[PDB]
Amino acid sequence: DSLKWIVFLLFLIVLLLLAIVFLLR
Amino acid sequence: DSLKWIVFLLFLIVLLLLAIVFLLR
Amino acid sequence: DSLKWIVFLLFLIVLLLLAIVFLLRG
Amino acid sequence: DSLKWIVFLLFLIVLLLLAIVFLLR
Amino acid sequence: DSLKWIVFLLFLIVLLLLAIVFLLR
Numbered sequence: 001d002s003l004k005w006i007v008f009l010l011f012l013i014v015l016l017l018l019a020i021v022f023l024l025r
Numbered sequence: 026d027s028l029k030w031i032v033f034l035l036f037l038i039v040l041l042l043l044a045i046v047f048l049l050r
Numbered sequence: 051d052s053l054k055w056i057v058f059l060l061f062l063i064v065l066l067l068l069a070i071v072f073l074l075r076g
Numbered sequence: 077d078s079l080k081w082i083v084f085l086l087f088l089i090v091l092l093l094l095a096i097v098f099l100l101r
Numbered sequence: 102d103s104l105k106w107i108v109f110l111l112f113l114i115v116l117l118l119l120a121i122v123f124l125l126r
Contacts, residue, residue: 002104003027009111010034016118017041023125024048028052035059042066049073053078060085067092074099079103086110093117100124 002108005108006104006111007027007030007034009108009115010031010038012115013111013118014034014037014041016115016122017038017045019122020118020125021041021044021048023122024045026052028056032052032055032059035056035063039059039062039066042063042070046066046069046073049070053082057078057081057085060082060089064085064088064092067089067096071092071095071099074096079107083103083106083110086107086114090110090113090117093114093121097117097120097124100121
């Protein structure tokens, strides 16, 4: 489907923002 | 529910972006 | 419907990204 | 429709991320 | 079709965030 990929990409975005916060701190 | 999943991930994204804003400022 | 909440959160995200742009500018 | 606004906001998010990348480069 | 555009923009956002992480590291 496509909503599954949308959710997975949003999860990847959450992970990448977590990593960005880690690197900023 | 898909839509519900998307709202929660976007809320996490908003929280992380607020954290990034306050880490920059 | 959750589409309204999705649009609200995306609008907040746009605002926060503009804030980040301005913070990186000066 | 709300899908058009979602696409528009995502496109603006892409533009803002491009601006962030350009500023960081 | 708007879902294809949404997935495309989300994938581009993921790529840009990966670039931001790779630039911060």
